Amino acid sequence: FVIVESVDPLSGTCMRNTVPCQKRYIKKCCKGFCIDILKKISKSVKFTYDLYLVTNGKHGKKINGTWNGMIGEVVMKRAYMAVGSLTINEERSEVVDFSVPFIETGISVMVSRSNGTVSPSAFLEPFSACVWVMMFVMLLIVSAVAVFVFEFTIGKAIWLLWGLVFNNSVPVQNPKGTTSKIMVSVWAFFAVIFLASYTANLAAFMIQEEYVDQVSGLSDKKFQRPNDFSPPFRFGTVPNGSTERNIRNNYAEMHAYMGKFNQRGVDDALLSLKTGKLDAFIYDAAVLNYMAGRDEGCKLVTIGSGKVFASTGYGIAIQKDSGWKRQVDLAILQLFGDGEMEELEALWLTGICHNEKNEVMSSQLDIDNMAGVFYMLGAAMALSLITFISEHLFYWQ
Amino acid sequence: WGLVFNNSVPVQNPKGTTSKIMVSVWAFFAVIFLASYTANLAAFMIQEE
Amino acid sequence: LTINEERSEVVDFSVPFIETGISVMVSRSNGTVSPSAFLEPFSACVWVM
Amino acid sequence: VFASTGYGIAIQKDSGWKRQVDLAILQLFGDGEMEELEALWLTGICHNE
Amino acid sequence: VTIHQEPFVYVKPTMSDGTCKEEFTVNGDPVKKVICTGPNDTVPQCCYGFCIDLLIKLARTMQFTYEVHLVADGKFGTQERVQNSNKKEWNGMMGELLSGQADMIVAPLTINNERAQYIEFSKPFKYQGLTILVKKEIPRSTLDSFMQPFQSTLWLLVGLSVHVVAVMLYLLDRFSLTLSSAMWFSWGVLLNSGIGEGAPRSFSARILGMVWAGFAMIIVASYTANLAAFLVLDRPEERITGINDPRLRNPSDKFIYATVKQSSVDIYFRRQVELSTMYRHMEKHNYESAAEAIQAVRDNKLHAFIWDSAVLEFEASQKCDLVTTGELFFRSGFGIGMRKDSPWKQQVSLSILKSHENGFMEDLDKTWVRYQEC
Amino acid sequence: TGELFFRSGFGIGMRKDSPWKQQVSLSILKSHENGFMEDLDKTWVRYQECDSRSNAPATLTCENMAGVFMLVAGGIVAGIFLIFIEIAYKRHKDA
Numbered sequence A: 001f002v003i004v005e006s007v008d009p010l011s012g013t014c015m016r017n018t019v020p021c022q023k024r025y026i027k028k029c030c031k032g033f034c035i036d037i038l039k040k041i042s043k044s045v046k047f048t049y050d051l052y053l054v055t056n057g058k059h060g061k062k063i064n065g066t067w068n069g070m071i072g073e074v075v076m077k078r079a080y081m082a083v084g085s086l087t088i089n090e091e092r093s094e095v096v097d098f099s100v101p102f103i104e105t106g107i108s109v110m111v112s113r114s115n116g117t118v119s120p121s122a123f124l125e126p127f128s129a130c131v132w133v134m135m136f137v138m139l140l141i142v143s144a145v146a147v148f149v150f151e152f153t154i155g156k157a158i159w160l161l162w163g164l165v166f167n168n169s170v171p172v173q174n175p176k177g178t179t180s181k182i183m184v185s186v187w188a189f190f191a192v193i194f195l196a197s198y199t200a201n202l203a204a205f206m207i208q209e210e211y212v213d214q215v216s217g218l219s220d221k222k223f224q225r226p227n228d229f230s231p232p233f234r235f236g237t238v239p240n241g242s243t244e245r246n247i248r249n250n251y252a253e254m255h256a257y258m259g260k261f262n263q264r265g266v267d268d269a270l271l272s273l274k275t276g277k278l279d280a281f282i283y284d285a286a287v288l289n290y291m292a293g294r295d296e297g298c299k300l301v302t303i304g305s306g307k308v309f310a311s312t313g314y315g316i317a318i319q320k321d322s323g324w325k326r327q328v329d330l331a332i333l334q335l336f337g338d339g340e341m342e343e344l345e346a347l348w349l350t351g352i353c354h355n356e357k358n359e360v361m362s363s364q365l366d367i368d369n370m371a372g373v374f375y376m377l378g379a380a381m382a383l384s385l386i387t388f389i390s391e392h393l394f395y396w397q
Numbered sequence B: 001w002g003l004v005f006n007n008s009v010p011v012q013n014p015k016g017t018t019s020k021i022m023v024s025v026w027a028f029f030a031v032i033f034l035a036s037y038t039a040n041l042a043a044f045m046i047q048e049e
Numbered sequence C: 001l002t003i004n005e006e007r008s009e010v011v012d013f014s015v016p017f018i019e020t021g022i023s024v025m026v027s028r029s030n031g032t033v034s035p036s037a038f039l040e041p042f043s044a045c046v047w048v049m
Numbered sequence D: 001v002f003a004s005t006g007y008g009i010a011i012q013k014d015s016g017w018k019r020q021v022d023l024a025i026l027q028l029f030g031d032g033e034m035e036e037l038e039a040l041w042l043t044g045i046c047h048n049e
Numbered sequence E: 001v002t003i004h005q006e007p008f009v010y011v012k013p014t015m016s017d018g019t020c021k022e023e024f025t026v027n028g029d030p031v032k033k034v035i036c037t038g039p040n041d042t043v044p045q046c047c048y049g050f051c052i053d054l055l056i057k058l059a060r061t062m063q064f065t066y067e068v069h070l071v072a073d074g075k076f077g078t079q080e081r082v083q084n085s086n087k088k089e090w091n092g093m094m095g096e097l098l099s100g101q102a103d104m105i106v107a108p109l110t111i112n113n114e115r116a117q118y119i120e121f122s123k124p125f126k127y128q129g130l131t132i133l134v135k136k137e138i139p140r141s142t143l144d145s146f147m148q149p150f151q152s153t154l155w156l157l158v159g160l161s162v163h164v165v166a167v168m169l170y171l172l173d174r175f176s177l178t179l180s181s182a183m184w185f186s187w188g189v190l191l192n193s194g195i196g197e198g199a200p201r202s203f204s205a206r207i208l209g210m211v212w213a214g215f216a217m218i219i220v221a222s223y224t225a226n227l228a229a230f231l232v233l234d235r236p237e238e239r240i241t242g243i244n245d246p247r248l249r250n251p252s253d254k255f256i257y258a259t260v261k262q263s264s265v266d267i268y269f270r271r272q273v274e275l276s277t278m279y280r281h282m283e284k285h286n287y288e289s290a291a292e293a294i295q296a297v298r299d300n301k302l303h304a305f306i307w308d309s310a311v312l313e314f315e316a317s318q319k320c321d322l323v324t325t326g327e328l329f330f331r332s333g334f335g336i337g338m339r340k341d342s343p344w345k346q347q348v349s350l351s352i353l354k355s356h357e358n359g360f361m362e363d364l365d366k367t368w369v370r371y372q373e374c
Numbered sequence F: 001t002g003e004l005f006f007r008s009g010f011g012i013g014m015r016k017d018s019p020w021k022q023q024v025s026l027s028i029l030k031s032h033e034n035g036f037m038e039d040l041d042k043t044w045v046r047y048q049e050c051d052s053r054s055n056a057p058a059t060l061t062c063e064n065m066a067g068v069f070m071l072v073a074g075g076i077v078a079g080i081f082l083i084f085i086e087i088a089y090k091r092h093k094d095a
Helices: A033-045 A070-075 A090-095 A130-148 A153-165 A178-206 A242-250 A267-275 A285-293 A325-338 A340-347 A372-394 B017-045 C005-010 D018-031 D033-040 E050-061 E092-098 E113-118 E154-173 E180-191 E203-231 E264-268 E276-285 E291-298 E309-318 E344-357 E360-367 F020-033 F036-043 F062-087 F089-094
Strands: A019-022 A028-031 A103-112 A281-284 A300-302 A309-314 C018-022 D002-007 E034-038 E043-047 E079-081 E088-090 E128-131 E329-332
Touching: A019 A033, A033 A325, A033 A340, A070 A090, A090 F020, A103 A242, A103 A285, A130 A153, A130 A178, A130 F062, A153 A178, A153 E203, A178 E203, A178 F062, A242 A281, A267 A281, A267 A285, A281 A285, A285 A300, A285 A309, A309 F020, A309 F036, A325 A340, A372 E154, A372 E203, B017 E180, B017 E203, C005 E344, D002 E344, D002 E360, D018 D033, D018 E113, D018 E329, E050 E344, E050 E360, E079 E088, E079 E113, E088 E092, E128 E309, E154 E180, E154 E203, E180 E203, E264 E329, E344 E360, F020 F036, F062 F089
Parallel strands: none
Antiparallel strands: A019 A028, A103 A281, A103 A300, A103 A309, C018 D002, E034 E043, E128 E329
């Protein structure tokens, strides 16, 4: 949202478009997009602008009786207008005048996209009951020729036709019928193409990615039940969180609990993500979109795909009933007008990570979770056991 | 060589049980050679010209 | 038009506005990889094992 | 490239604009407004080379 | 005069005394050579290249004895600011043309709008451009796959699960070998290797046959899925965006990206506005020697470099690990020295006219361009 | 479409001046502040029927799967009718 450094001592001071600001009062340059939005502001409104440092804690937020921050200085009237990007809280709104949206915003959380694929048995999912269709179908058709051989045992031969169905691999008792042999030739190339059906099925397994992890919204089974998860699911922002305060109004399962998971530092959130000691992280939504946007490597992902949580937007507020008030947001209007914001995607928004479509590749070994297909496979053991001992009951009477 | 190629050799399984496990050598291995044909076919589908 | 040597020899011309050259073109239609590229994946390892 | 070349706007031998004209071309490549002109012309919808 | 550039030319110290390696081509063409003088960092050494060859043919049209000199400074040349007196300093071989120290200095340092009003130029010898020198990573990603990257423990897990399976079949046996004929049997259900002993005819038996059947069926299927995993695969982001490159457009200390010190390309970056980023960063990062760029990539020294694009495309052969850039950046061209006025002027233009008109250019591709290894 | 084009927004009529003005603003403040917006997604937004693909995860295939194996089973009964009289060919020849 904003950028700054020390004014370059090589030339002695700032360069490029950097805008200086004093700090107790040491002038220092500032960079970043919304700064340039302020540039474009006087680029019509024509009001001189001199940047200044912020003392503590972002914008003004109610501290004891008063907002602590930039909007505090607004209450202090320390400036005609204010800069910096925070979606105005109803409180912040109720405090004093604010701007029109500079860019969209919202509540959000994020974490590292790491490991998972498609869940097990998706191969079986490709069958689409056609496996059953031709299963019973070709079964009865097999019985048909079995009867046609006149010129249990034939049932066992149908089991051989199930080897014809499944991977051959049935050594027992080829039937003498030559017409029945061509009957095997029916399932030969056909069922061969059913092995092919398994092939392309496996392709769509490899193809048709998913990229889905847990996001339930403002709460979750892993959130609305904060103490339930054996490993703690940690997501949230740093102290004095405005959006957190909204959550502090919303649900206490975190504002209560997340104080535990509470952390410090802005990028230090992404750093702890590199540590990954905590499940996830929440921060300014679109800002977080820049967090994934600037990524040394591909790890993190927004909680959700960007489905908006507490959709919002920021801007440059000023005092209640200020001078620029009316036509200011109009300057914002034209600002959206020329598309120079779309240009500012360069200046800020457009990321190197991007690829919000591309999910990359989950390729890895077979998972026990992925082996769950074989789990449901082996599950039928006790079932066939129930049928078998059931036949023993058929032998009781 | 049927063990090498797609099984499909009906004739004369050897009685050797140690030899049977010897067949088990080419079993999963050569199975993964069929897999070699698989991925091979992928690079056929993949790796355009 | 790219100035021919003739066109050049005719009279003064400009500096390049954009690159150019001789070219031909046709419809890309049908073909794949040539046959046996599957066998091409073997890389003699099929012979090795 | 077959017979690589390029076009431009020629004028008469020893014309008025002659010298600094191609210089105007030079700055023209300078600002990158040609890269913009990919829109005006060059950049294609087919693309996908 | 010029600077040693392998893609442009092959110029090494002389062989013995007035001597260089005498070799015909791989096509048997005996490519000529010539000797220019320079210090090792001021004496004659060997010089050859398809470019310099094009110089030779250039004389072969309009005859002038070709004197081979080398460059003194490292750069090509630019009108530049001195340290005092506020007087225009045209640098490099360009300055040598201001010095007139030669006839026409061959060089592929593209025609500069700055150098334009200063120095004359001809049509492009080889139409070319500049871009970012990059080196690709080494794709491997392979494994023993079905062995290695397939169900590491789980393959074994289902393995003993087959033991419990044949166990279940043995349970299905006694309600009307059992261990052993199963040790062949269900193990075959794993192998499908056709031992050929048999399978029980019990009502539950063949059902279990369908069970382990579909099981291993989907198992080998999963092996194929692994084959795709080896085949289809991420090969993650290669960056290489362009003049809009966000990593570039997002200045930080992580990526080391720059171009040559005093580079006509970096000159295209010199007069600019939005370019101010690398105009700061890369500037302090700018190495002088593009050879040091070749080795730097061989060293993986920086995260990125930039130089004449076509040149790199040639160097791409010299490096198996190189990474070509995405597209063209501000195409332009260069050639033999053009300044003041010469009878060689309109003539030389016509020489170019023959050059592209004829194929001795496209022929020379064999001498240089068409030559390819990587 | 591919991406956003010149995002902006609208709402109830706003003109001249009304006590409804700053009030209504605060109403919005509750709106996004509360979830009755996000709730209303269920009333409208969250309501969804048509699925969303990118590639063609057709893996089901059962219709076209029948589109091969079904008529193939046509080839199966082709010996029920054919291999009948064929089973009577050499047989009936020697009958």
